[PDB]
Homo-oligomer: A and B are copies of this chain.
């Protein structure tokens, strides 16, 4: 049985699996009322990707496809419909057992980024090269027009004209447009992948502590804002590098819970211990919300597989 392992990466060497951001801090929120059921950064300890999770850091909250036409929408700005393919360019097959194309955003909000295009057709007078354009864009994942599971979504631009129809289109995520009341940011509310009133399917399961005194431990990143007030954050269950490592290794899970220790490599001392659960998430024995204030060199080290009776030392 191939021994289970985690990568040896400090917090400053990790990135978020739910948005293209570095990990900033470890974080807890024991009194969170929402169901925690994110779809990116989901991977079992034996290497099975789940939900909309894929391996590319560049694929997280990215879209690839083609603009079909400019469309009408009551909201401010100029709106565009785009078909979306799989990130590798092959057509998305809605009959596949996934909630949506892999990489699709897994939260409600106004995702800010850049739409870019490189035309298929080339111009002889320009050295047989294609024309290009890029503009800021916003994707409202709560919108009834956000239907990635159906193979198309809508984005808005400040730019009123310079977006071409029928041309290869890329969305590069940068942050959020706003976290105002009317922008509906909620990192734990899933989009309706097939549109309003439809049930999401093939979801990675919800996660939660089962043991008294325990709470979820998150890898937190702060996400940029186009404007307005706020310090929004995105919490993932495991960094993208862990997803990548677990997938590579595919080590058999020898129980439902792996005991891991957060270690200071300088002192060698254990800062705290955590349970790493089979489905791919952490719990700690902590009675407070907020950042885990720990030396920058710290990293999780796999200790052993434990049983249903193991009690964590309080943080």
A298 to chain B, nearest CB (A): 14
Contact A15 B56, beta carbon cutoff 8 Å: yes
A-B contacts, 9 of them at CB < 8 A, read: A12-B88, A13-B56, A21-B58, A57-B58, A116-B225, A132-B229, A134-B224, A134-B225, A241-B244
CB distance from A73 to the nearest CB of B (A): 22
Q: Is the CB of A170 within 8 A of B224?
A: yes
- What 10 A-B pairs have minimum CB-CB distances, sorted nearest first? A132-B225, A57-B57, A116-B224, A126-B229, A129-B229, A134-B226, A13-B55, A114-B174, A12-B88, A172-B174
Q: Does A8 contact B (CB under 8 A)?
A: yes
In A21-76, the 8 Å CB interface with B consists of 21-22, 55-59
A20 with B20, Cβ < 8 A, contacts A225-B116, A226-B133, A227-B132 known? yes
Q: A7 near B: Cβ within 8 Å?
A: yes
Q: Does A260 contact B (CB under 8 A)?
A: no
Give the interface size class of chain A.
Answer: 35 or more
Interface presence of A131 (CB below 8 A): yes
Interface SS, A side: mixed
Residues of B within 8 A of A91 (CB): none
What is the total number of copies of this protein in its complex? Answer: 2
Chain A positions 158-175 with a Cβ under 8 Å from a chain B Cβ: 170, 172, 174-175
Report the separation of the CA atoms of residues A228 and B130 in the bound assembly, to the nearest whole angstrom.
Answer: 8
Distance of A268 from chain B, by nearest CB (Å): 19
* The one of B12, B129, B231 that contacts A118, using a Cβ cutoff of 8 Å: B231
Contact A130 B88 (CB under 8 A): no
Assess the B132–A20 pair: CB atoms within 8 A: no
Indicate if A212 sits at the interface (CB-CB under 8 A). Answer: no
Hey, which chain B residues are within 8 Å of A59, CB to CB? 22
| Residue of B with least CB distance to A64 | B22
Question: Which residues of B lie under 8 Å from residue A112 when comparing CB positions?
Answer: 134
Instruction: List chain B residues, Cβ under 8 A from A14.
Output: 56
Q: How far is the CA of A21 from the CA of B172 in the complex (A)?
A: 10
Interface residues of A in 119-153 (CB under 8 A from B): 123, 126-127, 129-134, 136
Q: Residues of B contacting A229 with CB < 8 Å?
A: 123, 126-127, 129-132
User: A183 to chain B: closest CB distance in Å?
Assistant: 12
Instruction: List residues of chain B with CB within 8 A of the CB of A296.
Output: 88
Judge whether A196 is part of the interface by a CB distance below 8 angstroms: no
A288 at interface (Cβ–Cβ under 8 A)?
no
